[PDB]
Design a protein around this ligand. Structure first.
Ligand SMILES: CCn1ncc(-c2nc3c(O[C@H]4CCN(C(=O)C5CCOCC5)C4)ncnc3n2C)c1C
Length: 826
């Protein structure tokens, strides 16, 4: 039971719990105890919530950011369904009320006691919301499908809640002694050290002498730094870099001079180094776990006298004219100006806190103590301000603790929109228990959808040693917190476990035998008991509310590309057509870049919708779940503009010229005046994806990676190369699109200038929120993507949105780019 839950978590996280105990570190032991307690208290509250409050945890509503419609309804036990026609503006209780009135006539004799469950889905309909605000209903409007829902009584929800139960005196200069190590390289060796407190150095760099190449070396040199022992800030970071010289990089290593309990670190320390591709402060403050092959370094940290960092009480005891002109990087005369006027910054420019923190001297403990005094009575800044404060440039913990006080006011949906970045910031952390972790973990245990996504965001990075312990430990506390969801997640891992083995079997066979022979062999490998049991009946990792019930083996296949991605189709009896959903399993390519690009498109859709403009965007699911291994959501009822341009023999869209093909495919898929809606659908999405790709700098755009839905909506795929790193992009407007936009006419400036309008409106709304994009991409520098490595990459976004201009200039300049693509298009 306890052993059963323990051996489950080990299988689930992919690391044995004993592997934590083997280290015997009191931090890891303190983390595991302090968290377990926290998450168990979270689970205790969760068990005594109301039935409607449990639905908000387990099935959080899926809402969007007059004209009646057909609706199907039924009850939990029976299969007898009733069909209604009710308003888009009707509340779910008005619908529920009818469902009782129809049973009152057939069955022959209280709405608030029930909830509306979406058939064959982990989605419910409740609350004070008109039915056109739900995703499943709004989906059914556009798509023309019929909502089929089940009436679940309060006691039936409560039956689940029960079954889903578990000091300043040290003025001497700072110094350390570089003793000895052990490595392999072909010259002489040097050991450049250097202190830091974020990206900035606490003092100058101090390189060692030249020892020879043949080495298991010894130095024993007292390296003295240009900073006092009391001047050191609580989050002081000492880095090191080993390299050969006649340059030749070899390895790096870092550590916190203070321990986790606030005490200075003592005498001798062994530091196992990580390999290089000159100095790296961002790199983790934990030794290389490959204790064997990793080159080590023993160093001595002098005995200064027990010295803890001072408590807050001790830290608490210790013209406005040309001020604004600069406040909108800065010179030293300006930096001094900003530090001098720090009180009026709190009292009349609180949102400038970040620019003020960067001017303070962290290598002089007076300026630090004076800054921390202001921060204790600084007002709550908005969410965008707090996001700026979570970057690597503000390592101080009182800042971090403040940013979390500000972030606490995030909506469960905004948290989900930012969660990816919040996880990459966990890499920057110095100690295991922290606010961010405690916060994420608490939000995760109050929302099963956050719990789900946070879990896969951690699990997908376990193959990386820099974070294996950190994440493994976090996932463990989540599993202590949600013992029922843990089991739900194990079924997904085991599905993914089989999907891996199936894809290797698919990779070999496809080389040897032909495609159809590999296909019937894939189907046979699938028909087995283990595969049918493992790949069936599970919540989708791409979306916890979608249920991947029965696998339709006949339809499952694999795309003919390189990594042979598996196409896996499903179907549900209960959900009907809403259960017929597919997934794509890729193996051997990292999908974290695709996930970020899709997050950015999903944000752009949300920003535009929030300013009344729906461009009919398609931010389909993409989810890394392991080492070069994730899931992509099959977008159904769509084809590539390459397959449509094949102009296939005796089809419903036989066209004479390529330019007409696109439009002819639309005419066949949408008969009557449905075509007018499909062209309107095409036009907005076309305008949408033109702006998103321009801004995100997505290149290598060809007919085989631009799709189009049967509804008319245009959408892009393969987001492996962005920010103009093919693996400065121009604006794109293919002639075949301009034809469909212009209703198939050579001249239609009425419909074209409308389209141009959408591209301009969308471009500006993004520019307004250019900081949000900057602050989210700023935190992702922690991930370690090849194309989001440095400031030069971020710069692409600054220059694409032109944040260093006015709305006149930016739109004046953007109007030229559009014309330059319009002209280039034949
Ligand atoms: C990161 C890569 N990425 N991102 C989005 C995607 C991706 N490719 C998709 C696709 O591609 C078509 C293109 C060829 N094809 C087939 O031949 C099918 C024929 C019938 O049996 C099933 C296969 C499927 N169709 C639908 N959704 C897709 N998605 C999300 C991909 C692959």
């Amino acid at each position: 039971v306890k052993k059963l839950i323990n051996s489950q978590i080990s299988l689930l996280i992919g690391k044995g719990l004993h592997e934590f105990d083997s280290l015997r570190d009191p931090e890891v032991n303190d983390f595991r105890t302090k968290m377990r307690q926290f998450c168990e208290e979270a689970a205790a509250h969760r068990q005594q919530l109301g039935w409607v409050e449990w639905l908000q945890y387990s099935f959080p509503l899926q809402l969007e950011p007059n004209r009646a419609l057909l609706v199907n309804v039924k009850f939990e036990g029976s299969e007898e369904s009733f069909t209604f026609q009710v308003s888009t503006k009707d509340m779910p209780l008005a619908l529920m009320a009818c469902a009782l009135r129809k049973k009152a006539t057939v069955f022959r004799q209280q709405p608030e006691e029930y909830a509306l469950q979406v058939n064959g889905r982990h989605e419910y309909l409740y609350g004070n919301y008109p039915l056109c605000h739900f995703q499943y209903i709004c989906s059914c409007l556009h798509s023309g499908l019929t909502p089929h829902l089940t009436m679940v009584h309060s006691s039936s929800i409560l039956a689940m809640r029960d079954e889903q139960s578990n000091l300043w005196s040290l003025e001497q200069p700072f110094s350390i002694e570089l003793i000895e190590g052990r490595k392999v390289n072909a010259m002489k060796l040097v050991v450049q050290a250097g202190l830091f407190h974020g990206n900035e150095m606490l003092c100058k760099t101090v390189s060692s002498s030249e020892v020879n190449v043949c080495s298991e070396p010894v130095w024993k040199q007292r390296l003295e730094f240009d900073i006092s022992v009391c001047d050191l800030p609580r989050m002081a970071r000492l880095c090191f870099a080993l390299y050969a010289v006649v340059d030749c990089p070899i390895a790096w290593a870092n550590l916190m001079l203070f321990d986790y309990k606030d005490q200075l670190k003592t005498g001798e320390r062994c530091l196992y180094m990580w390999p290089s591709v000159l100095l790296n402060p961002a790199g983790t403050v934990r030794g290389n776990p490959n204790t064997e092959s990793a080159a080590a370094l023993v160093i001595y940290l002098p005995e200064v006298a027990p010295v803890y960092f001072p408590a807050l009480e001790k830290i608490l005891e210790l013209q406005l004219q040309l001020r604004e002109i600069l406040e909108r990087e800065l010179y030293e005369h300006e930096k001094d100006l900003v530090w001098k006027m720090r009180h009026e910054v709190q009292e009349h420019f609180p949102e400038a806190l970040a620019r003020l923190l960067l001017v303070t001297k962290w290598n002089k403990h007076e300026d630090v103590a004076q800054m921390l005094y202001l921060l204790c009575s600084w007002p709550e800044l908005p969410v965008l301000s707090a996001l700026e404060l979570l970057d690597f440039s503000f390592p101080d913990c009182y800042v971090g603790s403040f940013a979390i006080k500000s972030l606490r006011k995030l909506t469960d949906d905004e948290l989900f929109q930012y969660l990816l970045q919040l996880v990459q910031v966990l890499k920057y952390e110095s100690y295991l228990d922290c606010e961010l972790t405690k916060f994420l973990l608490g939000r995760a245990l109050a929302n099963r959808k956050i719990g789900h996504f946070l879990f896969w965001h951690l699990r997908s990075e376990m193959h990386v040693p820099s974070v294996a312990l950190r994440f493994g430990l976090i996932m463990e506390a989540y599993c202590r917190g949600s013992t029922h969801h843990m089991k739900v997640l194990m079924k997904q891992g085991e599905a993914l476990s089989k999907l891996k083995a199936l894809n290797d079997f698919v990779k070999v066979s496809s080389q040897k035998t032909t495609k159809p022979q590999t296909k019937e062999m894939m189907h046979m490998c699938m028909r087995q008991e283990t595969y049918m049991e493992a790949l069936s009946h599970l919540q989708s990792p791409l979306d916890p509310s979608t249920l991947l019930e029965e696998v339709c083996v006949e339809q499952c296949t694999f795309m003919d590309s390189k990594m042979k991605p598996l196409w896996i189709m499903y179907s549900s009896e209960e959900a009907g057509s809403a259960g017929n959903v597919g997934i794509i399993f890729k193996n051997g390519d990292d999908l974290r870049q695709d996930m970020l690009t899709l997050q950015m498109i999903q944000l752009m859709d949300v920003l535009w919708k929030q300013e009344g403009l729906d461009l009919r965007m398609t931010p389909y699911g993409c989810l890394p779940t392991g080492d070069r291994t994730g899931l992509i959501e099959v977008v159904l009822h769509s084809d590539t503009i390459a397959n449509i341009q094949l102009n296939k023999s005796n089809m419903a869209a036989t066209a004479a010229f390529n330019k007409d093909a696109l439009l002819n495919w639309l005419k066949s898929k949408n008969p009557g005046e449905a075509l007018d809606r499909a062209i309107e659908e095409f036009t907005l999405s076309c305008a949408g994806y033109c702006v998103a790709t321009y801004v995100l700098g997505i290149g290598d755009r060809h007919s085989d990676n631009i799709m189009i839905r049967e509804s008319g909506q245009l959408f892009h795929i393969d987001f492996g190369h962005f920010l103009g790193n093919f693996k400065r992009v121009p604006f794109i407007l293919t002639y075949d699109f301009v034809h469909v936009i212009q209703q198939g006419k050579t001249n239609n400036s009425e419909k074209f200038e409308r389209f141009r309008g959408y591209c301009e409106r969308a471009y500006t709304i993004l520019r307004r929120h250019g900081l949000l994009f900057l602050h989210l991409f700023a935190l992702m520098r922690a991930a370690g993507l090849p194309e989001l490595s440095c400031s030069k990459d971020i710069q692409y976004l600054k220059d694409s949105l032109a944040l260093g201009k006015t709305e006149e200039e930016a739109l004046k300049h953007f109007r030229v780019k559009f014309n330059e693509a319009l002209r280039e298009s034949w």
